[PDB]
Design a protein around this ligand. Sequence first.
Ligand SMILES: *[C@@H]1O[C@H](CO)[C@@H](O[C@@H]2O[C@H](CO)[C@@H](O)[C@H](O)[C@H]2NC(C)=O)[C@H](O)[C@H]1NC(C)=O
Lengths: 104, 228, 118, 298
Amino acid sequence: ERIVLVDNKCKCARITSRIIRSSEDPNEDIVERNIRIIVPLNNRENISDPTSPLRTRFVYHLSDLCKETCYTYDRNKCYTAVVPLVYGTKMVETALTPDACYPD
Amino acid sequence: IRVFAIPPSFASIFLTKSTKLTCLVTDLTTYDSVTISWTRQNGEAVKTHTNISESHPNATFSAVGEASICEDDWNSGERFTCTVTHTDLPSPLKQTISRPLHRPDVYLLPPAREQLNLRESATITCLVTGFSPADVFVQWMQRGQPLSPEKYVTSAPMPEPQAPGRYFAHSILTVSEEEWNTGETYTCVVAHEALPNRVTERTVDKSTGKPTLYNVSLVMSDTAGTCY
Amino acid sequence: VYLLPPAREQLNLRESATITCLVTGFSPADVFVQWMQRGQPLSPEKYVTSAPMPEPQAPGRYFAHSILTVSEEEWNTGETYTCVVAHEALPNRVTERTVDKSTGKPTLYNVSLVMSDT
Amino acid sequence: HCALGPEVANVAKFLCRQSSGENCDVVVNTLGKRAPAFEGRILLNPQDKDGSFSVVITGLRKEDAGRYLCGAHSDGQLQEGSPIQAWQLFVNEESTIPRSPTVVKGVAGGSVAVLCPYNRKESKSIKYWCLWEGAQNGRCPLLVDSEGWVKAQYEGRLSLLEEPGNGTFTVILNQLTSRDAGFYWCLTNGDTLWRTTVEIKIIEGEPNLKVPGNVTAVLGETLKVPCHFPCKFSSYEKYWCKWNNTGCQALPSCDENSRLVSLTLNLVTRADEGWYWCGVKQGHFYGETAAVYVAVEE
Ligand SMILES: *[C@@H]1O[C@H](CO)[C@@H](O[C@@H]2O[C@H](CO)[C@@H](O)[C@H](O)[C@H]2NC(C)=O)[C@H](O)[C@H]1NC(C)=O
């Protein structure tokens, strides 16, 4: 019944809303803006370079994302960082998350 | 003697993309044999200006051109010179009209809370701010369905107070406040020339606006970096 | 591939730190691994790797290890580490994980999150 | 696929959907009854030797998920003690079906252009097109396919075509009229089977294209017929084509400023008899066209 104002899958924010149609009094209703965030406290600040510090601040200018440096691995679109391997050197690909980088 | 020439308006232009120019002649001598002829800046003739008009209520025969041109053929200052010869005018009187910026800003304020206690009048306000030039057209859309034109009332683009030369206008509309329970956000469709697609629609409903009951719900975990 | 960080106890013998890159539940045998950090490869004489040997529980899936030894100050320096694995059931053939002092078993959680314009 | 037995063949059939208080609301009946929300997008095939049959529903919406029952009754509705068959329905909402326009507006004498999507993998199938019929047990006969078969009543004013070709093709229908209004379905020969449905509304006005009416002509000469276009069609390429089962092919070098793309026929035989179309292109999409039939005299 709620109305997802925003669902930002690379900040794990989700502003919904729902008018709490009150007890059947006159129009003394109050609309209601649920919010929800799942901050990781595990990832980098360069989400796609696991050679950086972790994170401390998590800033949500909701104005900005009520409409690109956002910090959760989105499930569906996957990432990578070309990484050297040595068997001689070779500068070669990776797949920084599995089960989504599957060329299928 | 009143012979004014009407430049095209973005109202009709938005309507049918049919830029039109008319130079009507009024309160001249009461004779038939009135001829209408418009010209571009080369002087060449024009299209089917037709549909003769009778004598005015003040007993003067009425005539006006009906000149359709191209929207592109308007944007470089073409003095649309129209000539009308008449019995009284061995010197026919000529008329001309031609092509002589800032982005608008549209908001849609909801009614007042105290408005919503009289329990009849649900006022709604759409608006436009700080734009150049004028001639802008506005209208309100309700579920892909234009409202009653009389249902709303439109302003005219009076100039800005503090801006150098920008313009702004207004429009207001009422409905049953009982309707302000289905809401349907009553989309007000602005229509200004200086927009990327020439329309900058915005809309507002009850669910929009401002709530006075949040409940933020941050969670916190290592089981993250995922955004299911 | 999980990646366990050195036990705090070993950090009190005050010289050397050990990290255990792990692979699990995979088929067929013969995974390959190496260790990678700061964009420079780590010549294998730092690390030692197991070979496959069946899971107690999984009838088919093997596993393996890898071990790396590093001065604690080096691990105390921050100085994360990335262990990579290449194996023919992996989508682009290569996944990897990383850990530094902060990621692995921190005693300290310091969130400082700001939420503007509700 | 409803699978009742031969023992209720004489008896009518029905289809209801479960609700809160043990109350089916009916969606279609063997008695022609039909739910107003599901008007148009429902089909019903005739019953088989065993009375077996199938019900096709297209364009499902978020509230359409739920339990479904099909039965057989004298009143064609729910009662205690009548044979039934159940279904449980789920709508994805994490869907991959491209959102296509559902309503398409046209004017009398105008044209319509319809984009029809399908799954990209079966692009080599045989597209079809059918018209929905009410006031019945519901029917929907074919109108055109992709090999080039066309219904016998519409020679000249209708063609389909694979211009976009990436799971999307375009259909052009001109000479619109207010009698033609209704609902249209798109079909494919693939195993997966989308039936996208589009509605045509007719409004007031005259089409943007201007072409002279139906004209007769003498055998063996040079004749030219015009086609002016408004300023909103001024940013395109313009063309004439000759209508047939193959559809359009343009005739290069018939032009002006933003009006009057004119067909010219150097010499003519009666083999050039038929309908011709004047239309514009959207880069790789199609737009408005118009048609005129030409006779041959002597
Ligand atoms: C830091 O992040 C930026 C962007 O988030 C990365 O920039 C590019 O990332 C792509 C990913 O495929 C690489 O192909 C490019 O080579 C990167 N450009 C540059 C200039 O590095 C960047 O790679 C990240 N930091 C590091 C050290 O990789």
